[PDB]
Design a protein around this nucleic acid. Structure first.
Ligand SMILES: [Mg+2]
Ligand SMILES: [Mg+2]
Ligand SMILES: [Mg+2]
Ligand SMILES: [Mg+2]
Ligand SMILES: [Mg+2]
Ligand SMILES: [Mg+2]
Ligand SMILES: [Mg+2]
Ligand SMILES: [Mg+2]
Ligand SMILES: [Mg+2]
Ligand SMILES: [Mg+2]
Ligand SMILES: [Mg+2]
Ligand SMILES: [Mg+2]
Ligand SMILES: [Mg+2]
Ligand SMILES: [Mg+2]
Ligand SMILES: [Mg+2]
Ligand SMILES: [Mg+2]
Ligand SMILES: [Mg+2]
Ligand SMILES: [Mg+2]
Ligand SMILES: [Mg+2]
Ligand SMILES: [Mg+2]
Ligand SMILES: [Mg+2]
Ligand SMILES: [Mg+2]
Ligand SMILES: [Mg+2]
Ligand SMILES: [Mg+2]
Ligand SMILES: [Mg+2]
Ligand SMILES: [Mg+2]
Ligand SMILES: [Mg+2]
Ligand SMILES: [Mg+2]
Ligand SMILES: [Mg+2]
Ligand SMILES: [Mg+2]
Ligand SMILES: [Mg+2]
Ligand SMILES: [Mg+2]
Ligand SMILES: [Mg+2]
Ligand SMILES: [Mg+2]
Ligand SMILES: [Mg+2]
Ligand SMILES: [Mg+2]
Ligand SMILES: [Mg+2]
Ligand SMILES: [Mg+2]
Lengths: 52, 128, 187, 147
RNA sequence: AGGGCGUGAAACCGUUAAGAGGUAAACGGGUGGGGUCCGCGCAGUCCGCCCGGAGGAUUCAACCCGGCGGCGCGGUCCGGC
RNA sequence: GGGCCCGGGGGGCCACGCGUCCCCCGCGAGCGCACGGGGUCGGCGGCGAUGUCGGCUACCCACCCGACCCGUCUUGAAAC
RNA sequence: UGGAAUGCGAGUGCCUAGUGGGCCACUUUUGGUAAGCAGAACUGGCGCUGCGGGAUGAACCGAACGCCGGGUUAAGGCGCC
RNA sequence: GCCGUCGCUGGCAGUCGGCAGAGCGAGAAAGAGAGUGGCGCGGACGCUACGCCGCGACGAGUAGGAGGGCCGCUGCGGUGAGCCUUGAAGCCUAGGGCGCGGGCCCGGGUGGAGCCGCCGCAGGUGCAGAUCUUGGUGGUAGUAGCAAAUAUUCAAACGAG
């Protein structure tokens, strides 16, 4: 129920949103993996530019 | 022959009985530890005559004699000789109480060093 | 019993800064002494403004400080603000100022000094103006905050120019009924 | 932290701060924004005038890049160039005015709020307001249009 | 710690000891009597200065040598950062 | 009666230097007692090592006054 | 000569819970034979509130409450309880 | 008398000492002002200023709000040259005390291996109730009861029976 002055809010939480929460606790491990694949690729094509 | 404090004012206690919790005499499940009664019909809460009393700041003890031991001192827990030597300059108003879990061996050092510094020990004859 | 009411006994006001800042409290120690031991009402005002909250200490822009220090008879007076002096890009010429503030932004500092002015702290105002003599105490706009656009008669009452709380701004967001006669009504 | 919150102080107090009479029931009044035109009508009318109804034309497939047009007032115009740009122009004698290109600074339209310093300037922009051009012309400057 | 054995609570029960018992018990306030223990009581404090008796010494002040430290508007000393 | 209780011919005064002009006609020293900014005695007595001293509260018992069982919904609960 | 008496420091802004079953008494008062009935006005109460008195009691009378000593009272009382 | 709350948005940085001079509570504005001419070596406490001190008024409370807890529980970062097999936690206690209280300290006993104080951080953090959950135990109570379908007896044997 509304109470005095306030914004009218329409949160989109009327589905089963907890079944589809994507946490990011693997973010640092993803960043390491991506970097480790950039290094092994830079070694693989050297002296060709790493960027591409 | 015991050490005496700087002054020994008369200690006045407004109340000496403990405040037993309501209905704690009727059940073992109700410990006598105080709990503010909060029932709607609770007659102790409403301060009916002849009922259990409720604690309130009015019973407070005189600021001067508060926390004062009957000896006229105020206790201070110590665990070793080093902690004892913080009472060197306030030995006429504060005494040393040695913690329960100090080994009997070490109580000899604290009880000895306290004698040298004229600091009073509340429990010197323990764990002999 | 005494027929009296107690709801108003306790006055709601600050006796100290909510902040745990140690430099602020060292200044409060300083001005607690000056306020007590000197009859200078200025010290009491400054002492009080040191307790105030962040929104009660609005920042004072350079342009506003220049305007108020240009009024007749305020020459060589030290401008005093219990708060921050923010730079104003809209200002072109910055006159020589002497100022005392809690904070001065990095760009406001360069402009004041490059104009030849002097910036003080509040511990330096005491050694220069112990009673606050020759001072011009100044304050930032207290109602210059977005919140006060939302205070007053509720937006849905006649002649109320209060700002509503909307998640979005646009044609579809609270403009149909109650805001134009063609849709129900207007007030 | 949960140690600083009301729940810790409400231990031992029946009702947990929601009253003995009204209690804390699940959803009295409805869920969400239920009742706007009904038992909750005063709150909506009082605090959200305009909430109900429709106004104005629809526009399918709005692309907000088509109406990109950041604006700058004249009182901020001289910040788009370094300080020495202005002082050099003010003190030089040949009469040469600097070029301020507002598109390079990320603006398209020039608005008229404020006053300019008495210093000629050539301004480049996609759009001008009528008062912007007059004020720019009052100091001896010119308005240059870019596509 | 005796093979569902670390510790071993409460309810509830046996027994030993003490006290009490016809308005169920329990409870608040106020005293009183009796117990368990505690004061590790039972000729009652300690300190400063002073007076006087007995004594006794790494013997006081003041001076000299050496070291250390504080301050100096050294009215304005030299060197330094 | 009021006019520092106007002016003239035994009992209390928070009167007591003087040059004057004239209305009118800037510091004495001490000492002491106290109905004086909240109690002191520069006053005393008895008892005290094996049965006696102190121990609020605390254990048991007794008596006098008080005293209905809590939580809850309720205008109202000790509620049959 | 701040232009009656009396008393008192005022103003102002945000955020805000619980409530939205009430009930009782003097006086006034509608319906009803009336009701410890239903419905209103004013004020004060009970609810949320103990305490002295009315033996007993939500509201009656007195008086409202920090923990205490002394004194005096209110309403009520003073054969005995 | 004492406790607390509120108010005085009250007082104290002046502990200004022999490089000295002790005051500013007092009916009634503003200087215990600055000048120029006419023997001893001595003097209590204080001030965690988030501290300390003074004076005056006041103190009912459901629903509800707020403050402070040197109230209590579990874990984390610091710290306590912390405690502990000369005995930790836990548990028991007609032992001694402290606090208005939430609680806490110490003595004794049991126990046998770990625990706690302070500054911060975090929370699955405080039970009398929910015909609450699971487990244990009472009174009832040596009680109801061991009663449907006719029935047992004598002697001996084994056997502690
Ligand atoms: Mg609501
Ligand atoms: Mg809100
Ligand atoms: Mg009630
Ligand atoms: Mg009162
Ligand atoms: Mg109140
Ligand atoms: Mg209030
Ligand atoms: Mg409450
Ligand atoms: Mg409820
Ligand atoms: Mg609430
Ligand atoms: Mg509700
Ligand atoms: Mg809810
Ligand atoms: Mg064992
Ligand atoms: Mg083992
Ligand atoms: Mg086991
Ligand atoms: Mg076992
Ligand atoms: Mg037993
Ligand atoms: Mg017996
Ligand atoms: Mg009786
Ligand atoms: Mg009875
Ligand atoms: Mg109920
Ligand atoms: Mg009913
Ligand atoms: Mg009840
Ligand atoms: Mg009944
Ligand atoms: Mg309701
Ligand atoms: Mg009625
Ligand atoms: Mg009815
Ligand atoms: Mg109610
Ligand atoms: Mg009320
Ligand atoms: Mg009442
Ligand atoms: Mg009667
Ligand atoms: Mg009395
Ligand atoms: Mg009678
Ligand atoms: Mg209260
Ligand atoms: Mg027990
Ligand atoms: Mg083991
Ligand atoms: Mg946990
Ligand atoms: Mg339980
Ligand atoms: Mg039978």
């Amino acid at each position: 129920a509304p109470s005095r002055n306030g914004m009218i809010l329409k949160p989109h939480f009327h589905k089963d949103w907890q079944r589809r929460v994507a946490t990011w606790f693997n973010q640092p491990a993803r960043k390491i993996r991506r970097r480790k694949a950039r290094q092994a690729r830079a070694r693989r094509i050297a002296p060709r530019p790493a960027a591409g | 022959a015991a050490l005496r404090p700087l002054v020994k004012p008369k200690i006045v206690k407004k109340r000496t009985k403990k405040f037993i919790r309501h209905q704690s005499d009727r059940y073992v499940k109700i410990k006598r530890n105080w709990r503010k009664p909060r029932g709607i019909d609770n007659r102790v809460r409403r301060r009916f005559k002849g009922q259990i009393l409720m604690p309130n700041i009015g019973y407070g003890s005189n600021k001067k004699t508060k926390h004062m031991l009957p000896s006229g001192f105020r206790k201070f827990l110590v665990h070793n000789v080093k902690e004892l030597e913080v009472l060197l300059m306030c030995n006429k108003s504060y005494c040393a109480e040695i913690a329960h879990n100090v080994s009997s061996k070490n109580r000899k050092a604290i009880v000895e060093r306290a004698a040298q510094l004229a600091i009073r020990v509340t429990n010197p004859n323990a764990r002999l | 019993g005494v027929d009296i009411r107690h709801n108003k006994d306790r006055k709601v006001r600050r006796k100290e800064p909510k902040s745990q800042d140690i430099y602020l409290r060292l200044l409060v120690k300083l001005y607690r002494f000056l306020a007590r031991r000197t009859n200078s009402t200025f010290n009491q005002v400054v002492l009080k403004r040191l307790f105030m909250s962040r929104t009660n200490r609005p920042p004072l822009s350079l342009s506003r400080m220049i305007r108020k220090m240009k009024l007749p008879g305020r020459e060589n007076k030290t401008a005093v603000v219990v708060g921050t002096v923010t730079d104003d890009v809209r200002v072109q010429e910055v006159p020589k100022l002497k100022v005392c503030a809690l904070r001065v932004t990095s760009r406001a500092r360069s402009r004041i000094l490059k104009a030849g002015g002097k910036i003080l702290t509040f511990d330096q105002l005491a050694l220069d103006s112990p009673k606050g003599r020759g001072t011009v105490l100044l304050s930032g706009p207290r109602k210059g905050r977005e919140v006060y656009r939302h205070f007053g008669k509720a937006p849905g009452t006649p002649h109320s120019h209060t700002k509503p709380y909307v998640r979005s701004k646009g044609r579809k967001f609270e403009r149909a009924r109650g805001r134009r006669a063609s849709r129900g009504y207007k007030n | 932290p949960s140690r600083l919150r009301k729940t810790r102080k409400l231990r031992g107090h029946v009702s947990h701060g929601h009253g003995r009479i009204g209690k804390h029931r699940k959803h009295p009044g409805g869920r969400g924004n239920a009742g706007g035109m009904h038992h909750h009508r005063i709150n909506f009318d009082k605090y959200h005038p305009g909430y109900f109804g429709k106004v104005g034309m629809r526009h399918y497939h709005l692309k907000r890049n088509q109406s990109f047009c950041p604006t700058v007032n004249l009182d901020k115009l001289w910040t788009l160039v370094s300080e020495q740009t202005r002082v050099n122009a003010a003190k030089n004698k040949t009469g040469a005015a600097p070029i301020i290109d507002v598109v390079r600074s990320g603006y398209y339209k020039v608005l008229g709020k404020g006053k300019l310093p008495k210093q000629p300037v050539i301004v480049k922009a996609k759009f001008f307001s009528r008062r912007a051009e007059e004020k720019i012309k009052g100091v001896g400057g010119a308005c240059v249009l870019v596509a």
